[PDB]
Design a protein around this ligand. Structure first.
Ligand SMILES: [Cl-]
Ligand SMILES: [Cl-]
Ligand SMILES: [Cl-]
Ligand SMILES: [Cl-]
Ligand SMILES: [Cl-]
Ligand SMILES: [Cl-]
Lengths: 68, 67
């Protein structure tokens, strides 16, 4: 059968904490799992495609607001 | 003790799911709590200030890539 392909996952690592961005797909559509990983701890939220750009804008605006 | 006013918390709502952005401060400094809420489900990650801009860029770059 034909192959579907999603974008490559990426990470952002700080001192002793790592964030993984992983794209997935289900009956509802395409989503982003954002996982936080520490030595004894893994936790994640899932974000539908339709709000990714608004997520991006939200983080950038909060970043600028507190600049510094 | 010394006090600082943080930015106002905001939300993004979709079908049967709500995201909350809440600024906090702990022993590691300022962080963003991102909460995902459903009628009987609530979970969150916490993101230190120093990677907010890179989180923003990551979401925007992935959004554009799906064309
Ligand atoms: Cl594809
Ligand atoms: Cl990843
Ligand atoms: Cl996934
Ligand atoms: Cl899911
Ligand atoms: Cl909020
Ligand atoms: Cl944590």
């Amino acid at each position: 059968g034909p192959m579907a392909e999603l974008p490559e996952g990426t990470s952002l690592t700080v001192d002793n904490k790592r964030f993984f961005f992983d794209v997935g797909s289900n009956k509802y559509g395409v989503f982003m799992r954002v996982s936080e990983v520490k030595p004894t701890y893994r936790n994640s939220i899932t974000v539908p495609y339709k709000v990714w750009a608004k997520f991006g804008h939200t983080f950038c605006k909060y970043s600028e607001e507190m600049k510094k």
